Design a protein around this ligand. Structure first.
Ligand code: NA
Ligand code: NA
Lengths: 247, 243
């Protein structure tokens, strides 16, 4: 069966001290890393500090990766550099990159290609806007976004999909677990259509909308939701409850 | 004003290569009270690098967020840099403007955020070949500098970089010097002559052991933002040209 996968996307947050206290409270949770993946994504300049403090049961990665490889790309972190540093995971396609930094479907594709060439594991995010949903284009947008990279997947344990319901982020709308599950089912279908039943059955599809201690159980129970990419709630000590929801 | 020699490692290095490179740098005997020497590794290499380099080397990062802390996945805030005691940031490098659509307004906002968090900034600008061909060198550089020059408080703490984009992909030291003089005239007119004679203006085109002496000797060239030449142990000779 699929291994559940609970990730903390710390986004642009943290001090040396806050990370010391937060990582201390995460270490107190017993879990079995051969049964459940728990991954923490700190800011790049916090990675060494975070990786040292978190116990080995925790996996780690970074919040973005370059499409370009090594060379004259000031400000970028290459997949080669991540591999040399044994950084296990990268997030690609997060909506904040697509919103604030003009990241395109082709950038997501090229980042995934770079990541896989360097043996990184990729958490790849996509999802449709309020306008797109209101126009009844959910499946059309998600098909387009997934087919932008899906043919590159070389091992369905090592690329993890994230559904970001942009229509329920910053909009006042809240997605029900039923609504989230429906999209997850369709996402698994796109992978079945393009890659094969056995591959669709292996791939983890995480929910990446608002996750907190109160809704996490109702989401993880859904048949096609395999875990979470968590924002704000992963900056709290109570994140451990979100991890326990998947245990 | 002191000379300023910066290593922009851009997207390059391994843990092993940085060990050997940093050890060759530490072997160079120089006085940090007379010359600033700044290494800018990749964000994920910063801690590794900072630990390996003697204090005579200042260090920084190659980019900084225009937003504060919060919901900006993949960004590093000026507040975060300050908590890590990161001394310098690069802002406005032509690679950010080119590949990542960085604008003049992004540069100003990133400079505002850096100064607010006590970071010192190396801020880059420069004109394309099309612009140079149309006699727009001064007009472009004027527009780019005026985007942020009114923010500069202590003129030791913002370092200007001229990037001759028209030549990257070289400019003569004479050609470089003519631009640098114009840039200084821009700071004089907007900030005052005392401040313009205090501010460092670095050449940010191709710099290597072949041309560094010819460039630093120019009157309005105060050092360099060095690319691939700074990934080499011979970078110590580029530093020596400014000693
Ligand atoms: Na489930
Ligand atoms: Na000079």
């Amino acid at each position: 069966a699929r291994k559940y996968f609970v990730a903390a996307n710390w986004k642009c947050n943290g001090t040396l001290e806050s990370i010391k206290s937060l990582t201390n409270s995460f270490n107190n949770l017993d879990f079995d890393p051969s049964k459940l993946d728990v991954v923490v994504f700190p800011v790049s300049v916090h990675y060494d500090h975070t990786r040292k403090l978190l116990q080995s049961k925790f996996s780690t990665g970074i919040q973005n990766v370059s499409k370009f490889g090594n060379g004259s790309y000031s400000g970028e972190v290459s997949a080669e550099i991540a591999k040399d540093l044994n950084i296990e995971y990268v997030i690609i396609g997060h909506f904040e990159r697509r919103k604030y930094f003009h990241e395109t479907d082709e950038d997501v594709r090229e980042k995934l290609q770079a990541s896989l060439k360097n043996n990184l594991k990729a958490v790849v995010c996509f999802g449709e806007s309020l306008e797109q949903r209101e126009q009844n284009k959910t499946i059309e947008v998600i098909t387009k976004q997934v087919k932008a990279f899906v043919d590159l997947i070389d091992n369905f344990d090592n690329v993890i999909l994230v559904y970001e319901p942009l229509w329920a982020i910053g909009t006042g709308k809240t997605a029900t677990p039923e609504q989230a599950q429906l999209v997850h089912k369709e996402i698994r279908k796109i992978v079945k259509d393009t890659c094969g039943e056995k591959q669709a059955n292996q791939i983890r599809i995480l929910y990446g909308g608002s996750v907190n201690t109160e809704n996490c159980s109702s989401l993880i129970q859904q048949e096609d939701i395999d875990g979470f990419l968590v924002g704000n709630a992963s900056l709290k000590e109570s994140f451990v409850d979100i991890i326990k929801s998947a245990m």
